[PDB]
Symmetry: D3
Subunit: 291 residues, 6 copies
């Protein structure tokens, strides 16, 4: 029952994703292919990252993560292939995933395959890694790769060999740490008592606002559930509510709820209504909070 979780920027409007899928079923007949999603803002390693980092704990051990935006397609760049260390708890409390106490996942049990363009930056910081190879072997990639379609040549295809039990260390030479491209995560800055950060995501389709202030940033400024907070966005729009577990706590439909999202981050929303869209709020806007 080998599984591939597939995340790309290819979209769902044409056959691009189907092609990789065919090659996946062709290379590894027992495989199950799981779409993560294919709508990510193209060439955006940063937004890509957030769609792939929280996945491991949800998935059966042995799962192979094919994750690709490939703006450097057709050049001499080459994919990176890594077994991650810690499967890693997550959520708003930090716990394993599933029924009961959740399923605990053994160490070193997932492999990510991706452009070496910093797509994995956060996956690496949060899960760490056991081993890292450059994807070069003609047994796992095409001899004559489609110049403009490396997401399929250099990620979808070798991912399937990986699903079909190809020895990881045979994909190419070991990559050393400095050789794995990284993107810079900007930090939560202090400023008085207030923690200062940014809107990381509009949580579609609900229109919820996610921020890059983690609970750890919060529960280290001594902010916990129950505190009246002032959250200011775009520099100009203040908001006031207690930090609550979820949306129905804000009371009436339309009320403002400040919560920790399912990925562990400070968030703000309207209770059963969209916050972002009516006010046209967006990713990258400033976001400051204080008790």
């Amino acid at each position: 029952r080998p599984i591939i979780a597939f995340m790309s920027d290819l979209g769902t409007t044409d056959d691009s994703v189907a092609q990789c899928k065919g090659l996946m079923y062709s290379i590894c007949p027992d495989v199950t292919v799981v779409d993560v999603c294919h709508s990510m803002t193209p060439w955006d390693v940063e937004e890509g990252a957030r769609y792939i980092v929280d996945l491991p704990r949800f998935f059966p051990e042995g799962t192979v993560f094919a994750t690709t935006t490939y703006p450097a397609t057709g050049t001499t760049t080459r994919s990176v292939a890594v077994r991650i260390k810690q499967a890693a708890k997550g959520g708003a409390r930090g716990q394993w995933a599933g029924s009961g106490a959740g399923f605990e996942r053994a160490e070193g049990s997932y492999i990510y395959i991706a452009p070496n363009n910093g797509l994995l930056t956060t996956v690496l910081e949060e899960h760490g890694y056991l081993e890292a190879y450059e994807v070069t072997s003609p047994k796992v990639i095409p001899e004559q790769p489609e110049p403009t379609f490396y997401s399929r040549e250099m990620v979808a295809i070798p991912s399937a060999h990986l699903a079909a039990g190809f020895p990881l260390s045979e994909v190419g030479r070991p990559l050393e740490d400095h050789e794995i491209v990284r993107f810079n995560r900007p930090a939560v800055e202090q400023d008085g008592e207030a923690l200062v950060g940014v809107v990381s995501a509009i949580d579609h389709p609900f229109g919820n606002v996610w921020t890059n202030i983690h609970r750890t940033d919060l529960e280290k400024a001594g902010i916990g559930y129950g505190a009246r907070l002032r959250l200011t966005l775009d520099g100009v729009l203040p908001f006031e509510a207690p930090l609550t577990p979820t949306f129905a706590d804000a009371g009436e439909i339309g009320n403002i709820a400040i919560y920790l999202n399912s990925r562990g981050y400070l968030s703000i929303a309207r209770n059963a209504a969209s916050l972002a869209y009516p006010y046209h709020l967006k990713e990258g806007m400033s976001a400051r909070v204080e008790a």
Copy 2:
């Protein structure tokens, strides 16, 4: 070969669905996960209900329907699970689905699991049920659930256990009928011989206007195939046409067809052209039909 049929309001823009699925594969390795749709209007129970009500006859026996919009996530609210009675024929006519004379489905052959928020109103109505349980049990749901993701935790996780043969009656206590939340279906009123309903839906991607006026309503208003009909939408836009079985019956491309859809409800369209988009006709406008 267990089937989970999954209908959510999670959208396909991020990994929300993939996290559910991965856990589905974790709990039930042999399962097949089929996406119904994932794009329904957020928190819109009535809408969610149309995408799920019609499915049973189409699926093999023992299929689990994971159907979910969860605006009460994080509350002490618990899910509901039901084995439905009649799989029920459908379409414009009232026939079983499939090749030849259609395949019949044994009774008591499909389990719905959903928020107990009224999402199953029309399923329960159209299908009846044999049993119904509150989903409280720590063997099928998490001990500490993510307060913002009850679609994952109270729907996605349980359904995989049920697909994998977890006894339905052991998920929690027997709910009675009154404990199963309903929304009441606004009924087709009547002025003279005219019938007064609503645009229940715009049929994407085609722009076909679906009304809440069912075959049964037309029968015993005396309205059969070939009756010349005057139908008015939004109280402003009239259309005159005989009731035909299909679009091409209109004649010239772009002509008005009045018809019964693959669900058996009164509908209007242009033939091989889009009706609702040029006219910006939306869900919920009044729908009136005289002969």
Copy 3:
């Protein structure tokens, strides 16, 4: 363990595709269903052609291609089922797909089933065929096909039967060639050394511009990589760049690239930036190339 590749115009916003999937698993329990796409401009056979013609080389032998837009749903028309001849190499060079030198594919190995309305013009033109049959037999279509849903009834259902091993030849009588509807393909003309075409397509979600000026057309005015081209779009927009394999080749982000796409056609784009979106370029605009 057979595969159906499913392409329609049904959208992913309601339960329609799912319904087909349900019957596919119902008739052929061991099938894997692979979504090609379901977002094609409705009733646009030429567009639907694009999303299916390149598929066969990517799928294992025995894959069944279920391809459908049915404006004539509810009429006396019946689908056509065909065994293609050549699997066809493809892409920019014209080569097998896969790792190594690629998965060479045997002849006579894929079946397409489709409305008989020219959806398979391209597929035939490019792959040839071995046999063709009218899909009529009630062993593979309903005796009472739902008038408005021929894509489920006359394509999905019989695809499932074929996939499971229903012999192709038993679907109904064989079709003589002139009975297979084709649409006209506007050809690439010549003017001086220039080539005159159209914008076949916008490459979503990126915004690349696709033409119907194939490499064979190019390789017949002598045009290869590194040639200083002038590509005029919409009759008023000269573009001037070398023909290059990939986007990075243009240098700086946002620069103009003239390349051959993964399908083998002359195209134009910007290096890691959108060409079509800011300037609202569209399918059907004039396309001209010369050195």
Copy 4:
């Protein structure tokens, strides 16, 4: 104390109209300049015609009408200047404008100056003319007319001269009739007792729908106030109402009104609500009327 009525396509977003106004006050210091409108769809002579043809009855005798869209600005074309014959009654009944029984207007009393490009087709057709002259004399146009600004040079400037008393006959040689460009006016056809036209216009800012089915056309299939009409728009939209003088006559706010507009043409609207805006109705759509 003379008046120039100024209609152009120049917009009101820059200093362009002002520039003309400046020269008007410069050459004829005592002029009053009256803005007709300057928002007409650029280069659309038929549209520009609408905004000028009804003017003369509303203005004192001696008013000069400066009317201009000049796509041919910078060429050898020269404006035409004409003294209209009949001032023309107008409106729904056909009557003089003003208090009491209205300001009866003497014949030969208004001058139009315009590009010779059919802008005055309607005005001539409906008012006749007494004399016509090519505007050439350097006493009334620049010796070096700004190539791209003929509306200022070949219309505004000479309008100012005429207004001040420059004799019409001295502007240049007289034009024979065939030298006065007209565009074709599609006429109102007949079918049974029905009348077949178009939507001449959207009545901004309200959203009333205007047709080219005049009252004379109506008064020739015998159609008067109180007649039960069926007005079909865009070929698929029957509308059914009596012909009535004003909007209130339809009863409730939002109801459908069929009336004769202030220009004398059959129109359709809603009582104190917009018809055209919600349903995106447009100029050029088919219009048909019958009792």
Copy 5:
């Protein structure tokens, strides 16, 4: 030097306003016609009101105010004609208009002519009145009024007679107070210390937000210049700034300024940037303030 200030809902895209203007110049040759504006949301007596109430003090004594939205056009309704009592100070301080100490305007010096549909409600409350007549005399209105164009028949035309020195009391019978239609102004409600009201206007094109909380509501809750205020809109969006005279006081460009507008009302804005549009704020949204 008689002046007419003209306010309507007729728009600037067609010749409608020109027509009234011609009749105005025809009836009263010495008149100067001053457009107030013609873009007011059609049929909106409430929004109309705000465009006409502050005008008197700006204008030469004797000025006649023609102000019209006429949704009851063509019925037996008839305009109202009134000399207002107090010219009335205004602004944010309350003062006469102009250089020095401004120009003080004698009492009973302006006349408004308008539909009797409550257009004048606020003009009457704020300026009071000396005398009021119904506009019925055929010497000042047409004998056969254009049914759909009463703004010109029943306002523009008699306004000009009024400008030309027609005795006011000769327009028709005296109207008694109850006979002048009024619209209801909703009040500023108290709620703790906070005054509760509503967004009356987006101040176009700057995108400023105006409210219906007057200074008098403020300077009676003891709120003056210098107080830190909390202004909440749409129920959800709080704002915090001191009440300041103008926008540059907010400091940086983009900063929030809470001010008294030029009409004397509590307002909020960004300093040299739009507040309303980026957040899509609008008229009629709730607005609450507290010190």
Copy 6:
């Protein structure tokens, strides 16, 4: 016959302009008020400057130009007033305006009054000046000005006094040159023989693209009428065309014209079709031109 030429950013949606005008008529009863435009981009000095710089030659002698965007309203900032020196020829060529050989204007014949915010940068440049005064005096401005309406109080009111013959030198103290705020005009740089400017404006309503590249720049780049030009906008969209005097010179409707506008700046358009709107070309994009 005093003329006030009035250019504001007040817009024509409300009565802001009418309040200015009414005071203008109050102070100077014989004045004629001519609207330049009122719709310029709010607070945009550079833009405001293009609508005002070109006007002098067009107007009679002694015309006062009220020109105003006032983002510093309410500050201690005071207006500036200037008698300009040269009225200055213009257009593509450098000619006086009007019929025959154009009318010449005496020097020192027009007064600008404006915020001293740089709005008069290009007026002062193009015209020079003889005198310049800070507008501080309580005989021409209010003793207590409305803090939000300095366009009315520091521009509209003064200008009417100046129209009515209030001695220019008595409005306040003599400002010197350095006290007159300027914005520096971004200059046409140069790469090889190519010229690098900006889209200075989109010419509404036509969609004509105006660049900052002036005739003088083209002369002594050696570029004259009939030179074959390659012009690139936004660094992406090239256009090739000979320099022609006007649009019709392009040939077929819709063809590319490269030309000099009624202001003498390099420009590009389609012939009698719109260039900027289909392509969404906006003000401020790079403008490059090689021969």
